[PDB]
């Protein structure tokens, strides 16, 4: 059974997964994605340090591979992260001049989005803009451009490809009690009212065991920011308890604006934290209990 087809049967858009050439050409990743997932994301090959490792010298080979694979297999595509402090090459990090960085940032966004114009359902435009306490993270972008970097990034993105849904993404939004959760809500409300085209909030959902239950209330909170969409991104759960996974799926089912869920990867060995067995397929590419439990939940 296909979690993507069951999500669609329940009125959602997709169940997605992150991938890259190195996965698609190995194991059972491609076969599982074909059968079970309706949306793919280049895991790493659109991140700034991969795709623009020296300024204005882009390397699209890896991203092209995923985009072409997706098209050939009838999958939706997400891309990102366009602006993300933690995946920057050093040439970006060292810039101290506002106009310089603004133009670099605009060029980076426009170049990526125009290359695939019309093909991409979602771009994750800005990631990790908030500190844990809800303040804006003092990244090179905030420090050199100011808070306007958000507006500039999103307006640039909307100009580059108005067909795409534009998302802000952040982590540790998995509890309604966390200050970061409300902070992103109220800033997104403020920004959208000021004309910033933020179509979605994507919750990068990297959970420890037992944290799924929190998402049942965090996601409705996120949805209160009034974006047209919300989503679950980069989903993984240490231990991969069915209880945690079903909770995350149910949170999305319970939120009308939640269009879908993207898993961080297919099989545990390829996780960023493989030893925590946090994904839905084991290293033999067999579905784990949590995969079966999500299927069964969506069927009922
Ligand atoms: O949801 N995802 O797994 C995922 C992976 C990489 C990305 N980069 N930008 N957005 C992403 C989403």
Author numbering: 4 to 303
Paper quotes:
For this purpose, we selected the de novo-designed Kemp eliminase HG3 as a test system. It was generated using quantum mechanical (QM) calculations to predict an idealized active site pocket for transition state stabilization.
Thanks to this filtering strategy, only five rounds of evolution were needed to identify the highly active Kemp eliminase HG3.R5. Notably, HG3.R5 is characterized by 16 mutations, only three of which target the same residues (K50, Q90 and A125) as HG3.17. Although we corrected the data for variants HG3 and HG3.17 for conformational selection, we assumed that the Kemp variants of the HG3.R series were fully active as isolated, potentially underestimating the true efficiency of these catalysts. The binding of an ordered water molecule in a position to stabilize the developing negative charge in the transition state is also notable. In HG3.R5, a substantial movement of P45 away from the ligand (2.4 Å) provided space for the water molecule (we), which is embedded in a dense hydrogen-bonding network and forms a polar contact with N3 (3.4 Å) of the TSA. In HG3.R5, mutations acquired in the first round, such as M172A and K50Q, directly contact the substrate, while subsequent substitutions fan outward from the active site in an intricate interaction network that optimized ligand placement relative to the catalytic machinery.
